[PDB]
From a paper:
Polo-like kinase 1 (Plk1) is a well-known mitotic kinase and has been widely reported as a key player in cell division, centrosome maturation, and bipolar spindle formation during multiple stages of mitosis. Plk1 contains an N-terminal catalytic domain and a substrate-binding C-terminal Polo box domain (PBD). The PBD of Plk1 forms a complex through the conserved phospho-Ser/Thr (p-Ser/p-Thr)-binding module of its substrate. Human enhancer filamentation 1 (HEF1, also known as Cas-L or NEDD9) belongs to the Cas scaffold protein family (Efs/Sin and p130Cas/Bcar), which mediates signal transduction through protein-protein interactions.
Two phosphorylated peptides corresponding to 775KVMNSpSNQLC784 and 799LHYPSpTTALQE809 of HEF1, referred to as pSer-780 and pThr-804 peptides, respectively, were synthesized. Each peptide was complexed with Plk1 PBD, and crystallization attempts were made. However, only the Plk1 PBD complexed with pThr-804 peptide gave diffraction quality crystals. The final model included all Plk1 PBD (residues 371–593) and 800HYPSpTTAL807 of the pThr-804 peptide because the terminal residues were not clearly defined in the electron density maps. There were two copies of the complex in the asymmetric unit of the crystal, which were almost identical, with a root mean square deviation value of 0.36 Å for the 208 Cα atoms. The crystal structure determined at 2.9 Å resolution shows that the pThr-804 peptide is bound in a groove formed by Polo box 1 (PB1; consisting of residues 412–489) and Polo box 2 (PB2; consisting of residues 512–594) of Plk1 PBD. The core of the pThr-804 peptide adopts a β-structure, forming four hydrogen bonds with the last strand of the β-sheet in Polo box 1 of Plk1. In particular, Tyr-801 and Ser-803 of the pThr-804 peptide form hydrogen bonds with the backbone amides and carbonyls of Asp-416 and Trp-414 of Plk1, respectively. The phosphate moiety of the pThr-804 peptide binds to the positively charged binding pocket, forming hydrogen bonds with the side chains of Lys-540 and His-538 of Plk1, and stabilizes the backbone conformation of the peptide by forming hydrogen bonds with the backbone amide of Thr-804. The imidazole ring of His-800 of the pThr-804 peptide is located at the tyrosine cluster of Plk1 PBD and forms hydrogen bonds with Tyr-485, whereas Tyr-801 is on the hydrophobic binding surface formed by Trp-414 and Phe-535 of Plk1. Therefore, the structural analysis clearly suggests that the phosphothreonine at position 804 of HEF1 (pThr-804) plays an important role in specific interaction and recognition by Plk1 PBD.
Numbering used by the authors:
A (entry chain B): 371 to 593
B (entry chain D): 1 to 8
């Protein structure tokens, strides 16, 4: 919605300053560890041929985006639940309760949760997330797509994550803090304010992906 | 099916 348009114009602004062509680029002066995101996808598995795409946030909370456009999130407490239908309504259940309507989707939310815990590696394991509100519900995965060069994930709180398969690098763009986190080939990370990148620019690695990440935002809003 | 980065 407005968040996707907000993100898009922030990317056009940094890409129009031509940040890599600077007499002296100082991306060392755009850091903001006070802008590290609260949640981000650190595990995911795509089984869309049968059920959908299951994931895990930085908290152990597990969510699944099913093929029928419904969603099921299991909080990192192991019990609390959240079900969101295609049309948007939310419902708050538990696993201690026995909602018969979903017992075939809870089993598959469990299968995804077991697989990710069994085989896949937690991305951003060396990052301290930033503290969130006390009684804040988790965000769900609104829309995702997966190409050959990268995968794109769009949470319900605006954050857009992009993992490049070849470089292993990862971007986490937040339109609210106006920041991006770049994860290095060596799993090193940093958070840069976006308006500061206009004034000081950045290296070729970060600059290149900010240009590519714009066309991906354009493909989320073309749909 | 396509999983993300395997523990390794």
């Amino acid at each position: 919605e407005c968040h996707l348009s907000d993100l898009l114009q922030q990317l056009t602004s940094v890409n129009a300053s031509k940040p890599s062509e600077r007499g002296l680029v100082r991306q060392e002066e755009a850091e903001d560890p006070a802008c590290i995101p609260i949640f981000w996808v650190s595990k995911w598995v795509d089984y869309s041929d049968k059920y959908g795409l299951g994931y895990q946030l930085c908290d152990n909370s597990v969510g699944v985006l099913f093929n029928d456009s419904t969603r099921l999130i299991l909080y990192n407490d192991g019990d609390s639940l959240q079900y969101i239908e295609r049309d948007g309504t939310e419902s708050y259940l538990t696993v201690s309760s026995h909602p018969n309507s979903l017992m075939k989707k809870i089993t598959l939310l469990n299968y995804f949760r077991n697989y990710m815990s069994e085989h896949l590696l937690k991305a951003g394991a060396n990052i301290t997330p930033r503290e969130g509100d006390e009684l804040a519900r988790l965000p769900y995965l609104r829309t995702w797509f997966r190409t050959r060069s990268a995968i794109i994930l769009h949470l319900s709180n605006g954050t857009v994550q992009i993992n490049f398969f070849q470089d292993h690098t990862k971007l986490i763009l937040c339109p609210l803090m106006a920041a991006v986190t770049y994860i290095n080939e060596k799993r090193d990370f940093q958070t840069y304010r976006l308006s500061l990148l206009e004034e000081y620019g950045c290296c070729k690695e970060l600059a290149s992906r900010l240009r590519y990440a714009r066309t991906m935002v354009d493909k989320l809003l073309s749909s | 099916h396509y999983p993300s980065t395997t523990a390794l």
